[PDB]
Amino acid sequence: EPEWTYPRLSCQGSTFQKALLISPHRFGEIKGNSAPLIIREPFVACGPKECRHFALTHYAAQPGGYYNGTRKDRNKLRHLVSVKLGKIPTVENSIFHMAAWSGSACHDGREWTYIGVDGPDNDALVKIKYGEAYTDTYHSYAHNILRTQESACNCIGGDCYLMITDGSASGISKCRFLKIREGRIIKEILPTGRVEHTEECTCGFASNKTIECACRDNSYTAKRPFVKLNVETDTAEIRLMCTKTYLDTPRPDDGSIAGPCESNGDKWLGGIKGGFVHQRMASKIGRWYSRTMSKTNRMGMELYVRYDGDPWTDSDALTLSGVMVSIEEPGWYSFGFEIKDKKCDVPCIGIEMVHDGGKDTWHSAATAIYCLMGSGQLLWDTVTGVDMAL
Amino acid sequence: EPEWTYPRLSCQGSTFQKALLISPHRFGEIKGNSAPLIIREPFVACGPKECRHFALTHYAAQPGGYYNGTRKDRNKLRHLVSVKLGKIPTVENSIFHMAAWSGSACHDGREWTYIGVDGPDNDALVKIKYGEAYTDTYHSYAHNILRTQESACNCIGGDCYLMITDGSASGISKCRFLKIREGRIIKEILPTGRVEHTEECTCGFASNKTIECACRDNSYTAKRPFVKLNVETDTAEIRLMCTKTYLDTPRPDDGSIAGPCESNGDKWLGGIKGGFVHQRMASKIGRWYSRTMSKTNRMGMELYVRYDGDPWTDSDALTLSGVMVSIEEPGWYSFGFEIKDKKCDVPCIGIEMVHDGGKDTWHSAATAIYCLMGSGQLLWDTVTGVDMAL
Amino acid sequence: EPEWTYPRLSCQGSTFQKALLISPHRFGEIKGNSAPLIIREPFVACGPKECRHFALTHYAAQPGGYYNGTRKDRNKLRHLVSVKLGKIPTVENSIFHMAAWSGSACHDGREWTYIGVDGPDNDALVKIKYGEAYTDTYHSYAHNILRTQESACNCIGGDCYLMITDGSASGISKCRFLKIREGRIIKEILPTGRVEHTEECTCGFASNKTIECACRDNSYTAKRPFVKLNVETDTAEIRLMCTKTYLDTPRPDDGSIAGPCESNGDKWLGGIKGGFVHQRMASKIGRWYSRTMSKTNRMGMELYVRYDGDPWTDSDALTLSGVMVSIEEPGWYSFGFEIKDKKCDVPCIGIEMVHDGGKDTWHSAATAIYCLMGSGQLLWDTVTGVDMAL
Amino acid sequence: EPEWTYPRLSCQGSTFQKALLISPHRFGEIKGNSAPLIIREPFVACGPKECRHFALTHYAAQPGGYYNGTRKDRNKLRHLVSVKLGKIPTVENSIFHMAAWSGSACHDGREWTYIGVDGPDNDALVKIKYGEAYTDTYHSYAHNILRTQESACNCIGGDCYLMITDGSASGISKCRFLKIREGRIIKEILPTGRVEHTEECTCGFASNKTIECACRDNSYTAKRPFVKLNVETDTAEIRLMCTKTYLDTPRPDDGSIAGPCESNGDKWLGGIKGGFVHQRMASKIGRWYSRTMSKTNRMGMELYVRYDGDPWTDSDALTLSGVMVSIEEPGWYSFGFEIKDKKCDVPCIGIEMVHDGGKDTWHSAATAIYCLMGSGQLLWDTVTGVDMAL
């Protein structure tokens, strides 16, 4: 039978190139004969033999007449769905896993674990599904919107670690960590370090002994609190990334926050998810970041890198690596994923491109994928090609 | 090759939580591009590697123009269909098994058996299908609408037991039992005890030596006749559940039926299916019941429990365990199902939520699933989110 | 790997009952969101692990605007398609095998062979497909519409035998036989006996040493020429069935054709396909026939039997066994099929029910299946439930 | 596990016959309920157990409202999609592999490699995908629309060879060759001989030691430069086919280009893809060509042959072998493919039939397949049966 997954050295490449685009709404005209689901919070988790495209649907499709409610984040209709990667998320292609308005996913070499969050805002709840079975739950500790990553969780030899959090968006949201094995929580990690507001952690293996996530602070700063989880002692420590190249949105001009690394500067009320992906080489490591082109809005998407060094102390700017999405195209949530080759892991960064015709219409995104391919420079950007009028 | 199924100890949990929702009609607008089938009598039967969502379709989809006939129970168009669980029951996703207007299903570790009932009301007939093969039938003994469970049948080491019945709804409907092995009836069980009217038996393993069903009495009482089948001697004995917490609908105020356990009280003409599921623990057992919130109507759904004791004699009230469906939401048929983990069985209760715009329109339901997850208390209810006007 | 198929003793039963109904057009309203293909000439061929529903589509779906041409039998658009049995023949569910306006199919325990016929009426051609590969062809010998069975072909230990024919409908159509192994014709059988007009042979194993087909004579008689192929010497002999119960349509009153068995009587210009299926028992054999209720038209369907005896000499009437389709319902082509159980073969008879709103509309059928189940008598008929106006 | 593919001797046959037709737009009426994708550049690549129908979709379906842009060759929406052969290329049936506006595909007995080209016209890029993984890229050497075959690539014992090119359509487009193993380029072949303009190479194994492609010269000639790649030394040599029967389009009367084989004659600005397929016999070889009936336009399709001899020197005319598509039907790109039997390879030629209602509408093709079957002569042509008004 199957064996447990561990990260290996990433495949060989020097830059990312444009891989794939799933734009369901290109097939959502009232004059079309198709039915793409209203979803957001998309992500890809790649198991051994396959990758899955997950998302939270509003239990609604376009065209239709259940548009009002779609721009809202949490309700009793949302669900975690998936289609194997490369398939359009239509009503029939999609498998509905469980009810949730927050979520994550990961395949341990042997099976899929699905994490989903639902219930009351004051008493929400985390739910685990191992394959087809409901196996566990984790309660709301801070009684203030229990949430999870919204990206892939990370398994190493049978144990998968998940980030959750709880608290006010404008205040203190302190995240814990969940160690799940066979769809059951075998440990509850309480991080150390700057813990004032950590949410929507994009986590990836920086080797076998450690996992690092670039995350989200909704209040206090435009910097990203950076996690490092030692899988061997089962301890967590978080501290803000020191790079003058700020990754959250909004943010001010770069290098504008004066003072030691550990200084938040101004609050810049809000945040956004950003893709973070390692390129574990033999003698060295590359970390890839992507951020919105706009500093106040969700317009555009550009990706950077900086090999080695320490996320925590390096004041320095990151090396820009090209533009995946132009300022005229949307650039919302971002996450990183990894494809399993025979003898190497391929790093990738997905970019949710939300179709936002505002308040009285439907609300869904597209998904542009970029993955490390060969050398030279990033060559093309992505456009959705969607007309919200059709 | 595959091995025979037996129940094991249920997985560890203390309460049920909201698992999943399949609302096909959320995708049935005339302005939509989808096609969910008009069905009712839904149920889930979980084999080793998978669960299936079954139902009797009126061989019709929404939107369409074959709505007139859908509110009726038996005709020559109805069929037993299935989709793996988590898939929406559309025209193309669904597999049609055989023609039937009554039915059941169960997977013996090796294959699916499908039971379906059709023919004339005066001479209906039970039909068995082992995998893809028609293998057997069982004739109408009381010539008065031969029917079956409408929920999952129960297999233990190669033998599956099914409940059937026959008779007037307003009168005497005495049920027999069918022992099927390899899609062929190897024994005909005639129960003992109070046998005046037993129908729509929700049956589940209360261990290896016994199966218990909470069922339906359409005439004589608002209590539920409770079955106990000893799989070892192949004998059946039925007696009304003594709980002051009445489970059928309609029913009067609880504890209102004065007298020994065995007393029907007033007729309360009618009944409904209710989900019943055991939580077999090592030193003890939990039985889970769900009933309509409304005592005269099919509005709402709440679930209870009471560990151990005897269904037959216990006059006592049951412990309420939360509300799965609110009084403003429908709560029709209910059934229990069990998911197969690696080393444990997960108990579940499905709730059919019928969309009933009455007499001159379409008639189909939704399916809300709740399964045992962790501890604390049931946290959320279900709503269909369907507008019968679209 | 897989082993070669041979017929075994049929499963145990005494009568046929109503098994399944595939009515695609129940989902073909202009107000529906579905797309069932315009097809006719449906048949089912059951391999080891599965049965397939085949048909010749006019490369068109309902609703649409390619209806004109559908009532015609041969054109350059027709194709042999299939869906596993129980699935509705829609545009996406269906697999297109090859181009043909005549056809057959059979699975040898190891793979599917697909036979299809196309080309000019004066120089048509038979084409073999083994799995996904084009392997062979067989030319038009009588240059007058080379055709094939329109039902399942029959394989025994690696060799499959197929009937073809060629000639005028109003005149002499002498059929040959094709022995195919691994998708290649290894022998060309020329039958013996009355060979004036044999077409659309419904063939089934009457044991290991022989295959018998009840067939079609378009000119000369309302009786059915009956084939017997000895698989051991590879010889064929045909002679008209002697039963006073005539099986072709049209036909006159039964027992009206005076004279020895071998007498055609009046021509009764025309014919139709009829399902023929054996029930090979240990000490005996049952042959099942179905014929139209109407003697001049294609209205209704009734099925008969007569165990043992000789198709060739028995003047006697057959035993009626019930009505599968009422005079108010259509009853066109019929064929027999067999389902593979673990230790027995289940006999079946399918009935094509053509939706014929005549000349200026669409033209497609439904498929009612009846299979041997238990004992007693056939209990129900089939209706399509289709309204050609929607 | 699986073993590496090598070509074997082709199956036995003498002529090609009409195999299959995939006309998605037959299901694209505004009154239909289907959704076929706007695609062109279709091709089939057959692995061991299966064949796939690939094409570059304009990320659009018919009916819809994204028609404007479809007649253009390169944009940021195009994608390489596939459906197993015999399935209609609809939105849900189709798998999207990667973004590309040029492409190829091939299965090495063990896995699928997908090649796709995208990026800026001045700096386009070749991209390799082994199974689900992005593994490599190859940059634009002549900075003038890096393109690839548009047909199947060819693998022999683990190594697959691909043709690419780069340059002006009106000028010098010199092609290189790519040797890919496990989805990574292990060698870059630079051909020898007449190398002025070689593009869209249709390549097939002429044995184990060699691969030959009949290709496209957009400027200089109406003859086809003919490649021969020695898989053993990894060298390439190209020279124009000498046949008086010219294969490119446009072309003048045949035998009109006076002079030695190596003479281009007049430019005949333009070209088209043509199917080329070998029939490797034991003592001899057959090469099959197909060309447009029209000499100036893309109307019709006829196929020829000539066994043995040398593509390079033979001035002679080819033997016509029938007409697959009539002058009243379109005949655009053509390619050759091979189906894997148990002990032999079946040669095939696909013909893209473009639906070209010009400038302000949708733009997609159909696919007619012809494969070697038995003997005698090609018997039928193909028509799409599409009405661009519906």
Ligand SMILES: CC(=O)Nc1c(O)cc(C(=O)O)cc1[N+](=O)[O-]
């Ligand atoms: C818990 C929750 O509602 N999830 C959530 C989203 O679904 C979306 C966004 C967002 O910033 O667009 C934000 C948040 N968020 O609150 O983090």
Ligand SMILES: CC(=O)Nc1c(O)cc(C(=O)O)cc1[N+](=O)[O-]
């Ligand atoms: C035999 C039959 O018609 N089945 C049936 C149903 O399908 C539904 C109901 C019902 O109470 O809604 C009731 C019954 N019932 O009669 O039990």
Ligand SMILES: CC(=O)Nc1c(O)cc(C(=O)O)cc1[N+](=O)[O-]
């Ligand atoms: C060869 C051919 O055209 N096949 C055919 C059909 O498809 C249908 C019928 C028929 O009697 O309805 C008849 C015939 N037939 O001619 O046998």
Ligand SMILES: CC(=O)Nc1c(O)cc(C(=O)O)cc1[N+](=O)[O-]
């Ligand atoms: C590179 C590119 O644009 N590919 C391409 C096509 O997609 C189509 C045609 C063509 O001749 O129709 C031609 C060409 N071509 O330029 O070869």
Ligand SMILES: *[C@@H]1O[C@H](CO)[C@@H](O)[C@H](O)[C@H]1NC(C)=O
């Ligand atoms: C982690 O462990 C596995 C073996 O247990 C090894 O193959 C893998 O490469 C390790 N990770 C890295 C980056 O080396």
Ligand SMILES: *[C@@H]1O[C@H](CO)[C@@H](O)[C@H](O)[C@H]1NC(C)=O
């Ligand atoms: C019933 O039998 C099987 C072994 O035959 C055992 O594993 C199972 O646990 C038993 N049921 C229970 C509740 O113990």
Ligand SMILES: *[C@@H]1O[C@H](CO)[C@@H](O)[C@H](O)[C@H]1NC(C)=O
């Ligand atoms: C025909 O042959 C196989 C063994 O080769 C046997 O099992 C089968 O039963 C035979 N057919 C019948 C009716 O006995």
Ligand SMILES: *[C@@H]1O[C@H](CO)[C@@H](O)[C@H](O)[C@H]1NC(C)=O
């Ligand atoms: C090429 O090699 C394989 C064995 O490696 C052989 O079977 C195949 O036939 C060869 N090709 C031809 C045409 O012989």
Ligand SMILES: [Ca+2]
């Ligand atoms: Ca569909």
Ligand SMILES: [Ca+2]
């Ligand atoms: Ca912030």
Ligand SMILES: [Ca+2]
């Ligand atoms: Ca009652």
Ligand SMILES: [Ca+2]
């Ligand atoms: Ca006749």
Ligand SMILES: [Ca+2]
């Ligand atoms: Ca040219």
